[PDB]
Design a protein around this ligand. Structure first.
Ligand SMILES: CN(C)[C@H]1CCc2nc(NC(=O)c3cccc([C@H]4CCCN4C(=O)Nc4cccc(C#N)c4)c3)sc2C1
Ligand SMILES: CN(C)[C@H]1CCc2nc(NC(=O)c3cccc([C@H]4CCCN4C(=O)Nc4cccc(C#N)c4)c3)sc2C1
Lengths: 395, 365
């Protein structure tokens, strides 16, 4: 009684806990979803449980956060397992960006663990470099992530809408460096650094948005991965080389992607662009001969040096000896801003916003996903809702 | 509905001890899920393996933290029922003395009885009456259901009737205490259906308290719902009047020594109850009350029972009856005195044997 009890109360209250109040309700909720089928109901035990808990769980479902509580303005983005839509909470009238993740497409493949790091990072980062997660909830079909809306859009949109000069390229590269260092200080390697993940707020300042590929570093700041992760153009040779045996890499791989970002910002095209996706693979592996710069150059000596310093073999890459090695590069030596007060200074592009639901910085995309597949009626207990138990979070 | 009213209502649902979805009941679900899924055949499923790898360790941590059978030192077995036993226990940490009731989950699953304990749990835990044996803690493991209740050192009325030739002065007291005790159960919206001296327990003071509530049933619309105390209407819909029949059966056995329908053959008893007009064979008002309950009294209310000439006495009053001196006050030497007490298969697929027990865990305060 005195020896142990105090610890149990903390485990139920703690937001970082795996067995807190909201996570335990997820278990009861998942159990009802996975058992309520005629074939399964034949079992006296399964029928005994559902007859006692179906009515109260339906009462729970109505009380706790649901997709119905949010009014969808428009679809602003789309990923592999879902879509990002601009939403307004019906009661509070607060504007958010809601990320949906298809439980079907997640179960169909095997990806049912990637969201845990993303959820943890966004919800407990408390950094102006990470897109904040206010609420996380779920139903039988999706995983919902209620995050802060970034009205300035992504860097892909900025690079297509503007001929980015070196003064702007210096700002956005430095912001990415400080943003990645915040992720590194949290003990993570991003593994998917690209302009699609770099989002801008109402002020026009950078924030990292997707953390699905994030992996916790060991005591040596290293990681072991048998399967390569990222995007064909921004992938580093060491991560691209991943296979069962030699898949050993640290935080240096994220700095490669920074150089890939800087090249695309100043040139207009990705450094290892090929018309065939296999052609890109060979170009990255042969960076010693593939990395060229167009004959016409308005871009500085120090810009090409930082690009080439990042775009080298893992061992000779810049940033191997910490972030201070990057911060001290001649390319970042300017007069307009300082490393410690960079986010406090005026951004190059400040979004001209008319309303709280302004989507000018987001390109229109096909709203209809057709007809999404739903799990077939099981003949026995499969428990498709089990890998999602504990996802619900509140702030 | 809505915000923050829906959040407020949710917070109450998690804190409320009477709630089916409170903190302690939700942990039972997660705990049952681990017990029912952790098997090699079931672990083959990627989803079942994903859940177990993520929650097995923390659930083991919770099992150690939460109340368990190991926390109690068993003094001796004081009783035994169909699906378990009642044992006198001492909590290892607090050193507090209780009476612990065990209920075999295997025996409960083997038959079909997996709902009878819910009424008993609800009554004992939320009665807050000096007529009901209080339930302090309710917990469970993969094998049993545990009920940590208050110890009744005076024993049962069966032991009293065998150890004493109960006079009318004593019979008047114990019958009246049963009446007030049953009225408390009725006011809670429950029908006992098995009122017998085996269920009537006495405290350190020597005052009555109802104990076994396995046979209880919650009232429907307004007030509608093993041997020998059974009424003809139950034996073959009825109200609270069936419990009053058993009161008369108790009073007859207290004064005569034998039950009014006692038969050498158990089938003979069944026929005797149905023919109570001819089967029913030392005071005038005592016999008048036995015949009053043994009909087809208590039809309207409890006041008609209270106003009977048999209850008219000089020694006690209905409102202060439990405050007066009891006829038999137990002579107790220690806090663990027992003088008044006479001495599963590995599934090939998801069966979920722990599911009918989810929500049983309770902690008062
Ligand atoms: C292979 N395995 C191991 C896994 C590796 C990690 C991973 N991540 C996935 N992720 C997705 O399925 C997904 C769904 C919707 C949107 C987005 C992004 C990509 C397009 C925009 N976006 C995004 O998150 N935007 C966002 C985020 C935050 C705020 C705002 C705003 N305003 C916008 C991603 S699927 C998957 C498989
Ligand atoms: C057929 N169906 C529908 C169900 C009808 C209701 C029912 N009840 C059962 N009940 C049991 O299995 C059981 C287990 C242990 C003890 C006791 C009692 C019977 C002997 C004493 N006792 C008891 O509860 N004593 C008690 C209680 C409280 C405090 C103290 C003390 N001190 C002592 C009963 S099995 C069952 C089947």
């Amino acid at each position: 009684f005195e020896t142990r009890f105090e610890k149990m109360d903390n485990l139920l209250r703690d937001p970082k806990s795996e067995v807190n109040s909201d996570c335990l309700l997820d278990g009861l909720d998942a159990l009802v979803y996975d058992l309520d089928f005629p074939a399964l109901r034949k079992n006296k035990n399964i029928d005994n449980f559902l007859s006692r808990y179906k009515d109260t769980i339906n009462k729970i479902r109505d009380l706790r956060m649901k997709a119905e509580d949010y009014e969808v303005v428009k679809v602003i983005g789309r990923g592999a397992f879902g879509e990002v839509q601009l939403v307004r909470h019906k009661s509070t009238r607060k504007v958010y960006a809601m990320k949906l993740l298809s439980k079907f497409e997640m179960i169909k493949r095997s990806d049912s663990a990637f969201f845990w790091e993303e959820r943890d990072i966004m919800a407990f980062a408390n950094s102006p470099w990470v897109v904040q997660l206010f609420y996380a909830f779920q139903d039988d079909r999706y995983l919902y992530m209620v995050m802060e809306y970034m009205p300035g859009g992504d860097l892909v949109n900025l690079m297509s809408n503007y001929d980015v000069p070196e003064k702007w390229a210096r700002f956005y590269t430095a912001e990415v460096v400080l943003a990645l260092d915040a992720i590194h200080s949290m003990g993570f390697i991003h593994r998917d650094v690209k302009p699609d993940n770099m989002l801008l707020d109402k002020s026009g300042h950078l924030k990292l948005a997707d953390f699905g590929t994030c992996m916790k570093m060991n005591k040596e700041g290293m990681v072991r991965c048998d399967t390569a992760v990222g995007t064909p153009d921004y992938i580093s040779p060491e991560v691209l080389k991943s296979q069962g045996g030699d898949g050993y890499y640290g935080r240096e791989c994220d700095w490669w992607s920074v150089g890939v970002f800087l090249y695309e910002m100043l040139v207009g095209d990705t450094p290892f662009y090929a018309d065939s996706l296999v052609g890109t693979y060979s170009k990255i592996m042969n960076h010693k001969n593939s990395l060229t710069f167009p004959d016409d150059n308005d871009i500085s000596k120090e810009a090409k040096n930082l690009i080439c310093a990042f775009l080298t073999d893992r061992e000779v890459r810049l940033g191997r000896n910490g972030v201070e090695e990057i911060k001290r590069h001649l390319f970042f030596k300017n007069d307009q801003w300082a490393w410690e007060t960079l986010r406090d200074t005026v951004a190059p592009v400040v979004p001209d916003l008319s309303s709280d639901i302004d989507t000018s910085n987001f390109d229109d995309l096909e709203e209809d996903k057709g007809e999404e597949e739903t799990f077939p009626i099981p003949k026995a207990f499969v428990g498709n809702q089990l890998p999602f138990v504990g996802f619900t979070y509140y702030s």
